[PDB]
């Protein structure tokens, strides 16, 4: 372990997947040590404690200096914290993004893609000052079908993240890649745009197709996303399922 890699992750499936990859690839990583941390802002990180992860604060000046001093590479695997410029500028940082940059950069890309029909998939990219913005190292589109909810597309994106990590984790550690730029401008969706979508307008006029697309975009297993307000301020949450039958 001459080379120290930090995995900062708030996503148990990806953490579990990477730990297994490194275990079965011990020959490729004999001179590499991997530490795993979850991010300070995580509001239920108990599941990640089970896999030996402990909190790190990527916006603490103390932790940034320690990371910069100790680690050759930081991998963000759905890290809930924005890396400060002092981290991304002073150590090689690579993000695993559950969108196809530069389309629907930011929050819950597949929700926006079900509605706006822009591509989705996984992008592994160098991390710069801005969010889901740096040089593309590896990316792979995943198709969307008319019977998909957010959950269906998200599970598909996660299987593509895992496929790219299986093929490219060592490439990422040993910098065996080519930095690529998109010719397209793309777009960003923030947490406030998602809150916007969630507030249903029952008076909104449109096609059943558009309304079904909105509701399937906002349907994600047990999450309470799409709602309208009753007069008394109570909420009605709406979920939709779509099931293909040959």
Ligand X SMILES: Cc1cn([C@H]2C[C@H](O)[C@@H](COP(=O)(O)OP(=O)(O)O[C@H]3O[C@H](C)[C@@H](N)[C@H](O)[C@H]3O)O2)c(=O)[nH]c1=O
Ligand Y SMILES: Nc1nc(=O)c2nc(CNc3ccc(C(=O)N[C@@H](CCC(=O)O)C(=O)O)cc3)cnc2[nH]1
- Active-site residues, by number, are 97
**Residue 242 binds Na ion (CB under 5 A):** yes
Which alpha helices (H) appear in 56-149, and where do they start and end? 61-70, 85-88, 109-116
Q: Is 186 exposed, middle or buried (0-12, 13-18, 19+ CB in 10 A)?
A: middle
How far apart are the C-alpha atoms of 170 and 106, rounded to whole Å?
A: 26
> Given the structure tokens 């002092």, which residue do they identify?
86
**Residue 246 binds a copy of itself (CB under 8 A):** yes
Q: Residue 82 gets which letter from DSSP? A: P
Shortest reach from residue 43's CB to ligand X, in Å: 9
- With CB under 6 A as the contact rule, the residue among 6, 88, 91, 215 that binds ligand Y is 88
How far apart are the C-alpha atoms of 54 and 9, rounded to whole Å?
A: 10
**Residue 80 binds ligand Y (CB under 6 A):** yes
- With CB under 8 A as the contact rule, the residue among 31, 178, 192, 207 that binds a copy of itself is 207
When the beta carbons of 86 and 193 are compared against ligand X, the nearer one is 193
Which alpha helices (H) appear in 104-149, and where do they start and end? 109-116
**Residue 174 binds Na ion (CB under 5 A):** no
Residue numbers 147-166 binding a copy of itself by CB under 8 A: 147
Shortest reach from residue 157's CB to ligand X, in Å: 8
Q: Is 31 exposed, middle or buried (0-12, 13-18, 19+ CB in 10 A)?
A: exposed
Shortest reach from residue 96's CB to ligand X, in Å: 8
**Residue 189 binds ligand Y (CB under 6 A):** no
How far apart are the C-alpha atoms of 153 and 121, rounded to whole Å?
A: 9
**Residue 82 binds ligand Y (CB under 6 A):** yes
**Residue 62 binds a copy of itself (CB under 8 A):** no
Part in contact with a copy of itself (CB under 8 A); list of ranges 57-65, 70-78, 159-167, 227-235: 227-235
The candidate with the shortest Cα–Cα distance to 112, out of 221, 187, 200, 204, is 187
- With CB under 8 A as the contact rule, the residue among 211, 217, 221, 223 that binds a copy of itself is 211
13 binds, among ligand Y, Na ion, a copy of itself, none (CB under 5 to 8 A by kind): none
Residue numbers 146-165 binding Na ion by CB under 5 A: 147, 152
126 SS3 class: strand
How far apart are the C-alpha atoms of 174 and 3, rounded to whole Å?
A: 10
> Footprint of a copy of itself on this chain (CB under 8 A)?
146-147, 200-209, 211-212, 214-215, 224, 227, 230, 234-246
């Amino acid at each position: 372990h001459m080379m120290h890699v930090l995995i900062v992750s708030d996503n148990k499936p990806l953490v579990s997947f990477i730990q297994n990859l490194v275990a079965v690839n011990a020959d490729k990583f004999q001179s590499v040590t991997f530490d795993y941390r979850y991010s300070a802002i995580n509001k239920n990180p108990a599941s990640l404690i089970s896999l030996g992860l402990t909190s790190i604060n990527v916006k603490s000046e103390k932790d940034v200096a320690h990371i910069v001093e100790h680690y050759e590479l930081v991998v963000s695997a759905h890290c809930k914290q924005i890396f400060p410029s002092e981290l991304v500028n002073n150590v090689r940082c690579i993000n695993i993004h559950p969108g196809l940059n530069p389309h629907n950069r930011g929050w819950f890309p597949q929700v926006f893609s079900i509605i706006n029909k822009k591509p989705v998939g996984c992008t592994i990219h160098l991390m710069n000052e801005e969010i889901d913005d740096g040089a593309i190292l590896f990316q792979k589109e995943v198709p969307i079908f008319e019977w998909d909810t957010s959950l269906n597309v998200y599970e598909r994106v996660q299987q593509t993240e895992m496929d790219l990590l299986k093929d490219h984790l060592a490439d990422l550690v040993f910098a065996n890649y080519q930095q690529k730029l998109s010719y397209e401008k793309g777009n960003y969706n923030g947490i406030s745009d998602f809150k916007a979508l969630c507030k249903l307008n029952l008076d909104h006029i449109g096609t059943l197709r558009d309304h079904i697309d909105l509701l399937r975009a906002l349907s994600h297993g047990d999450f309470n996303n799409a709602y309208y307000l009753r007069p008394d301020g109570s909420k009605v949450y709406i979920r939709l399922s779509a099931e293909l039958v040959k």
